[PDB]
């Protein structure tokens, strides 16, 4: 019953930056933290073992100290193959535990998302469903605000929302928020609006259509 | 070298049993235990226990204790891992790890790729699949992004190309969200030259091996509906 807590749960940084993670037991667990790397769809993989122990075959810009309660992991001059995310492990005693996990992704200038509506399409509309699509096309950072609008009031619980990982050109996110309404729903309002914040932006985007005039 | 080779995907129903099986070579399989993981969808690692293959004994985890069962067989070199009664709940990445004692604590030196397990009620379907196009006086700038809502498809995965293969400058194809339905729903999007909206065709085609289905659909916005 011993939690590790990792911080911070993500950060952006740069190629040649030195970073540090920080892993923090709920109580003593001597010299016995290990550190993975994970990336997307892969196994984990061995970094460091007993606190500061790397690994064999591992670069040594990985580095681990550490005793007791409160660990780190510090990797000097970040290398592309780096981005990652990085896991730590206690095995002073079972059961073994793992942190939550930070994730370490690649910083990069402010880019206002461009901002698309679409409407539902009218092979869709016939079987009794209408998904109303915004796109938010390469921004970053990550954070941003999505909220739909249908005749002018604030919609909650009928929209879903996924973002892929950075781009491996510009290193930037992309953002698709589907509103999914019945077609007699659909039907019944007017004005259909996604408004968009995010850092890039100056005040909030806002792309709409008219049913009927679309 | 020291390999764990695990078996392949599994889509299951609540109440079925499984049992999944990691395989070791290239060492001597009964001098080291195996530990089992799972992630779920999303989420970070969870240890679940392990077992010595060389006595066949097991401990798991408290939250795992009486929900799972781990055994091996050193004959084969097989480890494994097993549900008489599966939850949709059970939906992640399971790995098998082998066990190197160092620096006076286990540690996971060698991972299996890890086997999906999806556990739903759900059935196999194809995807639907509808244009995204933009309004027809919409498009305002040098640049407009098209797409394809793929919706209603069971279990993972869809592939999307786009003009069979000839575009891949642009598209974003983002992750499945799993509707409350139960089925998933993905868009592909990429965006194009304003000016060839009227010249050019685009067309995304649409590949579910579980359900053998392959659907094309040509983007665009009629001039009435
Ligand atoms: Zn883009
Ligand atoms: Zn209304
Ligand atoms: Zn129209
Ligand atoms: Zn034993």
Redesign the interface.
Known sequence: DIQMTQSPSSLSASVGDRVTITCRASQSIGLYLAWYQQKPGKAPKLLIYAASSLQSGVPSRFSGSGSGTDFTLTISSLQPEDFATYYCQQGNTLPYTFGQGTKVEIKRTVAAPSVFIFPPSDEQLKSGTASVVCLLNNFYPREAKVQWKVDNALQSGNSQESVTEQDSKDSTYSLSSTLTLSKADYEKHKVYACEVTHQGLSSPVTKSFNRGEC | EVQLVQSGAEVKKPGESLKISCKGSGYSFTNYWI?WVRQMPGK????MGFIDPSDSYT????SFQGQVTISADKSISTAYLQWSSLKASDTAMY?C?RQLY????????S????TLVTVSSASTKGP?V???????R?TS?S???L?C?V?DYFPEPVTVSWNSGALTSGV?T????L?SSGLY???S?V?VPSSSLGTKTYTCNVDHKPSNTKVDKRVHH?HH?
């Not at chain 2, 160092?102 to 030196?109: A, K, N, P, S």
Request: hydrophobic share 35%.
């Open positions: 530990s970070g690692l969870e240890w401990n798991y985890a408290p790995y790890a160092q620096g006076y604590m286990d540690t996971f030196d991972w299996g790729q890890g639907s509808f244009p995204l196009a933009p309004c027809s919409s700038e640049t407009a992004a797409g809502l919706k974003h983002f992750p499945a969200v509707q729903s993905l868009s999007v965006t009629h509906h």
